[PDB]
Amino acid sequence: RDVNQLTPRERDILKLIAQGLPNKMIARRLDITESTVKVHVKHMLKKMKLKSRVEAAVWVHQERIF
Amino acid sequence: RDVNQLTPRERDILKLIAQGLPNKMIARRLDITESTVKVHVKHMLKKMKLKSRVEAAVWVHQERIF
DNA sequence: CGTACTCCTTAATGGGTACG
DNA sequence: CGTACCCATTAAGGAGTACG
Numbered sequence: 676r677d678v679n680q681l682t683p684r685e686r687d688i689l690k691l692i693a694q695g696l697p698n699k700m701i702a703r704r705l706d707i708t709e710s711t712v713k714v715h716v717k718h719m720l721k722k723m724k725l726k727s728r729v730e731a732a733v734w735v736h737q738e739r740i741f
Numbered sequence: 742r743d744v745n746q747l748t749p750r751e752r753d754i755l756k757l758i759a760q761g762l763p764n765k766m767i768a769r770r771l772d773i774t775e776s777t778v779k780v781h782v783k784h785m786l787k788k789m790k791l792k793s794r795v796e797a798a799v800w801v802h803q804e805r806i807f
Numbered sequence: 808c809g810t811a812c813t814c815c816t817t818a819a820t821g822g823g824t825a826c827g
Numbered sequence: 828c829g830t831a832c833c834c835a836t837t838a839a840g841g842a843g844t845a846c847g
Contacts, residue, residue: 688810695796697838710811717841727818728839729798730761736802750829764816776831783821794819795836 676723678740685722688715692728693735744751744806754781758794759801 691701702709759768
């Protein structure tokens with residue numbers, strides 16, 4: 676499990692998720708649609724082997740990823 | 742926003758949420774139904790004035806509550 | 808790559824009642 | 828309180844196709 680394997684946009688999403696934001700907010704913050712946010716979240720989760728955005732959030736925090 | 746206003750059961754659930762567990766898992770871990778878990782979750786979310794379990798997860802890690 | 812859809816399914820949430 | 832259900836909704840996830 677390494678954050679470097681993700682793309683820049685995917686890390687953009689991960690950062691906002693670890694800050695507890697729902698997809699709709701992430702989209703507005705990034706000026707992209709929720710649909711696109713969902714694609715990134717999905718890719719990030721499969722590539723990081725996390726089961727959900729919460730695991731993703733807890734990971735970032737415990738492993739001091741950002 | 743203080744963790745002491747919550748009940749013991751509620752803190753049990755928040756601790757498990759902060760570890761990234763979904764309601765179904767929390768229920769199996771505590772040996773209660775998902776229904777009861779959800780009740781504890783929404784109560785906790787209203788008392789702590791948090792919008793979602795992710796916020797609760799991030800809050801717990803930032804404020805090093807556990 | 809990142810954008811933005813389709814479709815479908817499951818998780819999560821917010822309100823209510825009830826009762827040892 | 829803690830348990831457990833009812834109702835209803837939105838949020839989230841997992842797959843696919845498409846295109847500059």
